[PDB]
UniProtKB/Swiss-Prot annotation, chain A:
It comes from Spinacia oleracea. It catalyses: RNA(n) + a ribonucleoside 5'-triphosphate = RNA(n+1) + diphosphate. This is DNA-directed RNA polymerase subunit alpha. The chain holds residues 9 to 233 of 335 of the full protein. The gene is rpoA. GO terms for cellular component: chloroplast; DNA-directed RNA polymerase complex; mitochondrion. One of its GO terms (biological process) is DNA-templated transcription. The lineage of its organism: Eukaryota, Viridiplantae, Streptophyta, Embryophyta, Tracheophyta.
From Swiss-Prot, chain D:
The lineage of its organism: Eukaryota, Viridiplantae, Streptophyta, Embryophyta, Tracheophyta. Belongs to the RNA polymerase beta chain family. This is DNA-directed RNA polymerase subunit beta. It is found in: Plastid, Chloroplast. It comes from Spinacia oleracea (Spinach). In plastids the minimal PEP RNA polymerase catalytic core is composed of four subunits: alpha, beta, beta', and beta''. When a (nuclear-encoded) sigma factor is associated with the core the holoenzyme is formed, which can initiate transcription. DNA-dependent RNA polymerase catalyzes the transcription of DNA into RNA using the four ribonucleoside triphosphates as substrates.
From Swiss-Prot, chain E:
This is DNA-directed RNA polymerase subunit beta''. Belongs to the RNA polymerase beta' chain family. RpoC2 subfamily. It comes from the Eukaryota. It is found in: Plastid, Chloroplast. DNA-dependent RNA polymerase catalyzes the transcription of DNA into RNA using the four ribonucleoside triphosphates as substrates. In plastids the minimal PEP RNA polymerase catalytic core is composed of four subunits: alpha, beta, beta', and beta''. When a (nuclear-encoded) sigma factor is associated with the core the holoenzyme is formed, which can initiate transcription. Coiled coil: none annotated. The gene is rpoC2.
From Swiss-Prot, chain F:
The gene is rpoB. It comes from Spinacia oleracea (Spinach). DNA-dependent RNA polymerase catalyzes the transcription of DNA into RNA using the four ribonucleoside triphosphates as substrates. This is DNA-directed RNA polymerase subunit beta. Belongs to the RNA polymerase beta chain family. In plastids the minimal PEP RNA polymerase catalytic core is composed of four subunits: alpha, beta, beta', and beta''. When a (nuclear-encoded) sigma factor is associated with the core the holoenzyme is formed, which can initiate transcription. It is found in: Plastid, Chloroplast.
Length: 225, 116, 130, 315, 145, 126, 382
């Protein structure tokens, strides 16, 4: 009889290519609903959305992880560490392959990656390698889409296939607040949400996926048995 | 003595040596630093001059004068404050430059490059 | 009793803090009923030179279908991050007493007794220096 | 001991009553295991060795110096109405107890004269409170009565002196992590510890950095060209890596003695044995009972605490 | 113990209100007596026998007034709950953070003239901290003996 | 894992980021200590550092403080810490950094209930 | 110049005329002790034991203005800068700290802090220098004087450096005439440059015209004994009786804090003077008025922080505090008790200003100055 539930986006800043922020508001929520919505949405956003990333890097003519290469200022382990931060997008479950074959004194960035048709990078200037002298540099990579943090074994040696324990975190941070509405006798409350993502997704999409994963999870009970 | 490198590059010269340097023939810009030990801001000036003397390896000559030793000579050079630098052109046609205060090193570079 | 609190008044307010805090919070909540959410949540939303009163809100609702829920949402759309972060103190479960989030800088500086005599610029470094 | 740059420095400055021609841990009395009122400017009073040999092995004060005749000396500022030239002297224990060494301040004014204000002092082997007019010497250094380990504790004046021993002893067991990070709050002595640890690579000549590779740095200055080889990966006596890293890029200049390359747990020109982490003090579920900590997953997938250990098997 | 939660800040170490007067008055009698001691009014033993007695009486008066202060003004102070409930922390131990640590002892017996008139919250001075190290050493030459 | 003030510890559990208390800006806590350890060992010097660390993390500045700063003033460390906290709370609009009713403390929430722990908790960056 | 509608703001404005410079120490003499010509790591030992003229060394007028505005007052600066990067950064530094720059004139003819001289080898082989082109700071003409700062400002403050250049002599005298026509006081600071430390008679001839126009004068202890008699006032200081002391204080060989009588400073006194201040560093401040005189007692401490102590800029803070309390409290002129009470704020500011490296980096705040004043002085004094 009094008002209807409304939700809207009140702010969205693009601080950088791989960092996006978004604040949202909900309208006349009666008691108890706001806390449940806020806590469920925070948990879902922190641990339900899935984001693809590089999981295994294969290099040519390299003995081990802690080795040096002529003409490269960055050690191999440094290259793995720098390679873990590359952000990617996809929507299909399954592992894929990728490669990077670059010449010598260039300076290698994230735009030098070669990607399958359905995978694209979001930032295009993330430093991944620095080159000084002319040496042909060829590295193969594997891309995977999982949920949450996963740790992999060092198996599948080949010449060298170093597995990077990539973190599947598309949402950097989440916050919420439950204010008061002062609706006379009836106690209403205003709920504010706040999402920081890393550019793999965007607000109003991470929120969508996080709501849908939750409504996935709550569902078995509706069926009888 | 060629075995261990000198910690400080700026060489302290007396008044007469400075007179000989200015009077005699030169081919590189000359820097004259006025300083005293009791001086407050002169430690920073000494550090900046030491840094500047490394970038300009052989293209400039940097010397310093202690006003506690040569006071009348410093007074004659129209010095009215301790953190003072004198830029001397390698040619007698161009006039000298007097800079007062704790000037930044970049302006010093501009002074002895674009004006000397 | 006089101009400055005495050592007994302070040690008594230390015992009865929560009563005064509850009175302040009750007054702040009671303000919402008369004022209305629209005008109450406008002190922290600067750069919205509207009406903020539940007399012309009804006039706007008669002019356009927006009720006293979409005008509030519209004002809460030019808030800026800092103003929202400060406004969050009126949260239903944080409950900052109104006196705390409105004290002047002079009053807050008296908690530790003014600036330090030894300047803090001697301690401050830069996290990106060698 | 090469666990971390701190331990290399700490090991060199040690004193012990043990060894040939000295006392042992069994036939040592209890008075020899106490702080005499003379190990003040010379021997740290809160850094010793726990166990049976307690009070027999200690460290040196930061400003301490072995003077003539093998006597430890400490600096003190002489107060006299002549203004000689250098007002600081290196006092020996024999000349220490016959002077009145103030440790107070001149920030106190009464309706009379300032020279009758009272400050604590140290005459003979006691602690008096005297007027400013009968003060012969005045210690002015904060890092004068402590050692290297005890001077790395911020706000040490707020910690009980009982805990200082183990606060100092738990910094020599730190593991140099893979990537280092500087401390937000410190005492300012980390810079000199890093300088003197020997882990760094300091320039021995002037000039410009004309070549850098992650195996070497080549500098050109005053004609000759100097090559400095870096330490890429090595093994410590306690099975820990020692990984250096260049600091200044190509083309820039360095004076003598300035830093050229970093080292293990030495980000910047400063010592760095740990990481800054958000912390909340609260009993969570009994999982922090007694002295238990409850860390999060963020410390294991961002490599916040991750170190390389190299073991040497010889056959 | 979680839902309620407890923590130790800087303003929860609640020094009793009357310490401002007692320490000031204790300093006055130490100033007057040490000023008359130079006039020949009193001898050395009397000066020694009093500088030990003001700071012992004052310190033991703050300690006995700690709980009545806590139990009436701030019954739920985190330091009070931790110690009064018997979980962890003696009355003497709380007195070190709140109150006075005065009258430490020289290793060969005997008290030291200089009293530690500052908390651990306020922060000891250089001479006061060094005095507190005398009792620090004979805390580890005891656990090993 | 050990601090610089003699507060040692044994890691007991490792929790996912969604299962830990978060401040009023949503940032999950990275480590949880036991408060009772402070009255026992009597090392208050950590708490100061704790609070001060927070200020640094919110101001991009590092402090190099010599010991025994209580010679210039009375309770000088308190002035330093509280002034830095207020400056960090004012320059960056985070009114939870310096709560002017229990300075240095703030009311954190529960990571698995969305409820505020009933009493304010001291947080920092040690 | 009469354009205004509403009354002026609460803190009266201060007029700061001179040259804008960064970290400048005018007063230079021959120090007896030197600490190594190369190693600057040990030069700080000359800050614990100053050469008795750099005990509280004053600096440029911009430093005084910055210290005054940082103490809770309001100041404006008149000067000229070049169209350089240094000139554009000096005004930025002054603007960042609420110093009004409405009267700072930018010009392109001359360069900031750079003056062109010429080598003029004389008889024998002693070189000389003659100013061919003047520096930007000392190139202000009377036409470009902001006739709004002068009208509003209630105290006109300038230092003796402007007396070393020809054009600024006329410009300064014109500004003084304008300010006096508008009813403002004249504050004279005697931070003597090096060339003015040559002889007493020449300096007295040089500064007489400016001295006779001043309403308030502030000089150091050495800048007064130099102006009256250096040899006599140095022989009087180092004197101990051959047989027996006189009272008892003479039997303790304490430092010499001599309060000059009104018959010794009479040659430096005139009818228009309202105050004469002689500062022995931050230790003591002797104040002389038309009807009374006295000494305010203070202290100093640079060994409290031996590694971050730098006496440069303390005199500017002392003068700025004096001006701030003069403008805030207008009853100090004829009340000795209020005068003594309000003159300890300046001492506290001067004490704080010596605890950090850099003249402008660590000027104290008003709250910090009040805190130190209350912590050092007994409640009866403060």
């Amino acid at each position: 009889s009094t008002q209807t539930l409304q939700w809207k986006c009140v702010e969205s800043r693009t601080d950088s290519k791989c960092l996006h922020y978004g604040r949202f508001i909900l309208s006349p929520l009666m008691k108890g609903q706001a806390d449940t919505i806020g806590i469920a949405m925070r948990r879902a956003l922190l641990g339900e959305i899935e984001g693809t990333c590089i999981t295994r890097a294969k290099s040519e003519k390299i003995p081990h992880e802690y080795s040096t290469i002529l003409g490269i200022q960055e050690s191999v382990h440094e290259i793995l560490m720098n390679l873990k931060e590359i952000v990617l997008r996809s929507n299909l479950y399954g592992t894929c392959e990728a490669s990077i074959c670059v010449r010598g004194p260039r300076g290698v960035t994230a735009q030098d990656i070669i990607l399958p048709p359905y995978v694209e990078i979001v930032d295009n200037t993330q430093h991944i390698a620095s080159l000084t002298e002319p040496i042909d540099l060829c590295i193969g990579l594997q891309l995977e889409r999982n949920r949450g943090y996963h740790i992999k074994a060092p198996n599948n040696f080949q010449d060298g296939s170093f597995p990077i324990d990539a973190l599947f975190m598309p949402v950097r941070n989440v916050n919420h607040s439950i204010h008061s509405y002062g609706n006379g006798n009836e106690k209403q409350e205003i709920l504010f949400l706040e999402i920081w993502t890393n550019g793999s997704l965007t607000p109003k999409e991470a929120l969508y996926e996080a709501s849908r994963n939750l409504i996935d999870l709550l569902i078995p009970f509706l069926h009888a048995e | 003595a060629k075995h261990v490198r000198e910690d400080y590059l700026v060489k302290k010269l007396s008044a007469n040596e400075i007179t000989e340097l200015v009077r005699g023939e030169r081919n590189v810009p000359l820097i004259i630093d006025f300083y005293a030990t009791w001086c407050g801001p002169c430690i920073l000036m000494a550090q900046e001059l030491e840094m500047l003397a490394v970038e300009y390896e052989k293209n400039a000559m940097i010397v310093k004068v202690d006003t506690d030793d040569e006071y009348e000579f410093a007074r004659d050079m129209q010095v009215r404050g301790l953190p003072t630098l004198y830029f001397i052109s390698p040619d007698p046609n161009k006039d000298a430059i007097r800079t007062e205060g704790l000037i930044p090193i970049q302006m010093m570079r501009d002074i002895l490059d674009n004006d000397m | 009793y006089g101009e400055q609190p005495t050592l007994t008044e302070t040690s008594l307010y230390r015992a009865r803090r929560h009563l005064f805090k509850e009175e302040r919070l009750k007054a702040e909540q009671e303000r919402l009923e008369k004022i209305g959410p629209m005008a109450f949540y406008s002190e922290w939303v600067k750069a919205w030179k509207g009406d903020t009163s539940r007399e012309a809100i009804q006039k706007h609702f008669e002019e356009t279908g927006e009720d006293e829920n979409t005008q509030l949402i519209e004002m809460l759309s030019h808030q800026t991050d800092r103003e929202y972060r400060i406004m969050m103190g009126t949260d239903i479960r944080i409950r900052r007493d109104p006196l705390a989030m409105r004290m002047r800088e002079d009053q807050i500086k008296e908690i530790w007794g003014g600036d330090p005599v030894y300047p803090t610029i001697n301690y401050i470094q830069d996290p990106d220096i060698v | 001991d090469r666990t971390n740059p701190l331990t290399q420095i700490v090991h060199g400055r040690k004193l012990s009553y043990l060894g040939p021609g000295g006392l042992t841990g069994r036939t040592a009395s209890f008075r020899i295991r106490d702080i005499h009122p003379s190990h003040y400017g010379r021997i740290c009073p809160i850094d010793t060795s726990e166990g049976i040999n307690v009070g027999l092995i200690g460290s040196l004060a930061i400003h301490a110096r072995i003077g003539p005749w093998g006597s430890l000396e400490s600096p003190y500022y002489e107060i006299s109405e002549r203004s000689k030239r250098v007002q600081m002297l290196y006092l020996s224990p024999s000349r220490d107890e016959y002077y009145m060494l103030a440790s107070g301040n001149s920030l106190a004014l009464n309706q009379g004269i300032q020279e009758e204000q009272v400050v604590p002092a140290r005459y003979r082997q006691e602690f008096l409170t005297i007027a400013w007019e009968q003060v012969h010497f005045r210690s002015i250094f904060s890092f004068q009565y402590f050692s290297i380990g005890a001077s790395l504790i911020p706000f040490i004046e707020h910690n009980d002196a009982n805990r200082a021993l183990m606060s100092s002893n738990m910094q020599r067991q730190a593991v140099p992590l893979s990537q280092s990070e500087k401390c937000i709050v410190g005492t300012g002595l980390e810079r000199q510890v890093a300088l003197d640890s020997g882990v760094l690579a300091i320039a021995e000549h002037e000039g410009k950095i004309i070549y850098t590779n992650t195996d070497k740095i080549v500098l050109l200055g005053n004609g000759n060209t100097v090559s400095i080889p870096l330490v890429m990966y090595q093994r410590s006596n306690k099975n820990t890596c020692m990984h250096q890293k260049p600091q200044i890029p190509r083309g820039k200049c360095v004076k003598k003695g300035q830093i050229l390359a970093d080292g293990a747990a030495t980000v910047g020109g400063e010592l760095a044995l740990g990481k800054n982490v958000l912390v909340a003090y609260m009993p969570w579920e009994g999982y922090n009972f007694e002295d238990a900590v409850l860390i999060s997953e963020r410390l294991v997938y961002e490599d916040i605490y991750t170190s390389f250990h190299i073991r040497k098997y010889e056959i | 113990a979680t839902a309620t939660s407890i923590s130790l800040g800087i303003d929860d170490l609640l020094t009793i209100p009357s310490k401002g007067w007692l320490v000031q008055d204790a300093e006055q009698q130490s100033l007057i007596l040490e000023k008359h001691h130079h006039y020949g009014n009193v001898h050395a033993v009397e000066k020694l026998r009093q500088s030990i007695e003001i700071w012992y009486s004052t310190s033991e008066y703050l300690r006995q007034e700690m709980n009545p202060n806590f139990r009436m003004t701030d019954p739920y102070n985190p330091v009070h709950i931790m110690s009064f409930s018997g979980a962890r922390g003696n009355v003497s131990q709380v007195h070190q953070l709140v109150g006075m640590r005065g009258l430490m002892s020289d290793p060969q017996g005997q008290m030291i003239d200089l009293p530690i008139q500052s908390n651990l919250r306020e922060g000891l001075s250089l001479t006061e901290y060094i005095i507190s190290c005398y009792g620090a050493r004979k805390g580890v030459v005891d656990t090993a003996v | 894992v050990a601090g610089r003030h003699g507060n040692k510890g044994i890691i007991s559990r490792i929790l996912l980021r969604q299962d830990m208390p978060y401040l009023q800006d949503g940032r999950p806590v990275d480590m949880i200590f036991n408060p009772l350890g402070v009255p026992s060992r009597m090392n208050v010097g950590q708490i100061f550092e704790c609070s001060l660390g927070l200020a640094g993390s919110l101001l991009d500045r590092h402090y190099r403080i010599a010991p025994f700063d209580e010679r210039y003033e009375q309770e000088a460390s308190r002035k330093l810490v509280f002034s830095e906290l207020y400056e960090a709370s004012k320059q960056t609009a985070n009114p939870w950094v310096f709560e002017p009713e229990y300075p240095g403390k703030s009311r954190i929430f529960d990571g698995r209930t969305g409820d505020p722990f009933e009493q304010p908790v001291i947080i920092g960056n040690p | 110049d009469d354009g205004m509608d509403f009354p002026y703001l609460d803190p009266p404005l201060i007029c700061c005329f001179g040259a804008v410079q960064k970290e400048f120490v005018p007063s230079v003499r021959v120090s007896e002790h030197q600490m190594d010509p190369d190693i600057y790591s040990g030069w700080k030992m000359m800050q614990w034991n100053p050469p008795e003229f750099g005990r509280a060394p004053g600096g440029p007028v911009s430093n005084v203005a910055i210290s005054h505005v940082r103490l809770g007052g309001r100041a404006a600066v008149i000067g000229k800068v070049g169209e350089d990067d240094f000139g554009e950064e000096l005004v930025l530094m002054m603007n960042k700290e609420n110093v009004q720059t409405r009267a700072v004139k930018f010009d392109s003819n001359v360069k900031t802090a750079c003056s062109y001289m010429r080598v003029k080898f004389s008889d024998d082989g002693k070189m000389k220098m003659e100013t061919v082109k003047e520096a930007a700071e000392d190139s202000l003409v009377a036409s470009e004087l902001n006739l709004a700062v002068l009208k509003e400002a209630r105290i006109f403050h300038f230092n003796s450096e402007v007396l070393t250049s020809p054009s600024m002599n006329t410009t300064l005298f014109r500004a003084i005439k304008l300010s006096k026509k508008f009813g403002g006081l004249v504050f004279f600071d005697l931070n003597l440059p090096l060339p003015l430390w040559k002889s007493r008679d020449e300096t007295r001839e040089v500064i007489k015209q400016a001295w006779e126009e001043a309403n308030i004068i502030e000089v150091s202890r050495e800048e007064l004994e130099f102006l009256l008699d250096e040899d006599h006032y140095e022989r009087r200081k180092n004197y101990r009786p051959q047989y027996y002391s006189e009272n008892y204080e003479q039997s303790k060989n304490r430092r010499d804090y001599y309060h000059y009588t009104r018959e010794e400073i009479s040659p430096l006194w005139h009818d228009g003077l309202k105050f004469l201040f002689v500062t022995d560093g931050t230790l003591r401040i002797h104040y002389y008025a038309p009807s009374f005189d006295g000494v305010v007692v203070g202290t100093e401490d640079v060994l409290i922080t031996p590694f971050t102590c730098d006496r440069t800029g303390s005199g500017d803070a002392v003068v700025a505090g004096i001006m701030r309390k003069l403008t805030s409290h207008p009853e100090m002129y004829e009340d000795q008790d209020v005068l003594e009470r309000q003159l300890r704020f300046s001492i506290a500011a001067g004490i704080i200003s010596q605890w950090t490296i850099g003249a402008v980096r660590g000027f104290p705040t008003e709250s910090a100055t009040q805190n130190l004043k209350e912590q050092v002085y007994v409640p009866s004094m403060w």
